Ligand binder design. Structure first.
Ligand SMILES: [Ca+2]
Ligand SMILES: [Ca+2]
Ligand SMILES: [Ca+2]
Ligand SMILES: [Zn+2]
Ligand SMILES: [Zn+2]
Lengths: 156, 163
């Protein structure tokens, strides 16, 4: 029974801008995310990224626009020793009414792990609802009030 | 006070082998472990100073705007992760400019060379080229020649916190 952290991307690992990181100059890391995720890995947590990317692939959010910043974000995490077991993406618009948009559990169905010691960490109510739907704990990330240093201390 | 004077290109981030300049985001790549290891060094009491030769920066050969995107992102990553450079010292000159500030000349770091400005015995230049090592000699401090395999960030982190 592995301990997992299911971590939101936009607004949680990196800053959330039109709400899409579609340019290199819109990429910024959240404070302390690297050293704290390293700390959490050391304590035995495995990391899984799970993200809604509204309209990824469309005129308003071309795949290539997402790829640049995302791949770089991944370069930085990986070179610093932070590893994500999977990066799980829902590219759909809300109007699409798809199977995979958080807080639906589709993307994570295979994990449904040590439930008592697993968490979804994200900055929206839907991340917390995903945790409920998965039967695990939820941590509502907030840069000011419940941030990476706080989570790193709490969970270790 | 112990200081680490650290090169950028090839040391904190990789050096593009074509023109040796990070002038696009697709040419930006962090060296392994640089973030946790600089945090470790800071926690042991080191202050950090960046010192970099950026040949032709601010001219058509390397436009300021082109340097800024990747450099500012790099700095944002460092700052947001808790890595603080006291100063970022830049020589923008071409070798043929014969300027006063190009490493291994000491002009950029002259303030650190004042009588009681730093602990010379326990301060280092860290860089991947002979000019960084010569800078150290000219400053009267130690030099570490960065090598991704044989003298890397984890090794430096360990070596400089040894007691
Ligand atoms: Ca979010
Ligand atoms: Ca260099
Ligand atoms: Ca260079
Ligand atoms: Zn979907
Ligand atoms: Zn110069």
């Amino acid at each position: 029974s592995q301990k997992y952290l299911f971590i939101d991307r936009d607004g949680t690992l990196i800053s959330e801008p039109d709400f899409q990181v579609d340019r290199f100059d819109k990429l910024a890391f959240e404070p302390g995310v690297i050293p704290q995720l390293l700390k959490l890995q050391k304590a035995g947590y495995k990391l899984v990224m799970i993200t809604n990317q509204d309209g990824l692939g469309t005129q308003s959010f071309p795949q290539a626009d997402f790829d640049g910043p995302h791949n770089l974000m991944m370069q930085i995490f990986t070179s610093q020793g932070v590893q994500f077991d999977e990066v799980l993406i829902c590219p759909h618009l809300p109007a699409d009414e798809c199977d995979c948009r958080k807080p639906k559990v589709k993307l994570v169905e295979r994990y449904l792990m040590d439930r008592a010691n697993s968490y979804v960490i994200g900055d929206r109510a839907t991340d917390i609802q995903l945790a409920e739907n998965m039967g695990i704990n939820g941590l509502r990330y907030d840069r000011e009030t419940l941030n990476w240093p706080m989570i790193g201390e709490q969970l270790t």
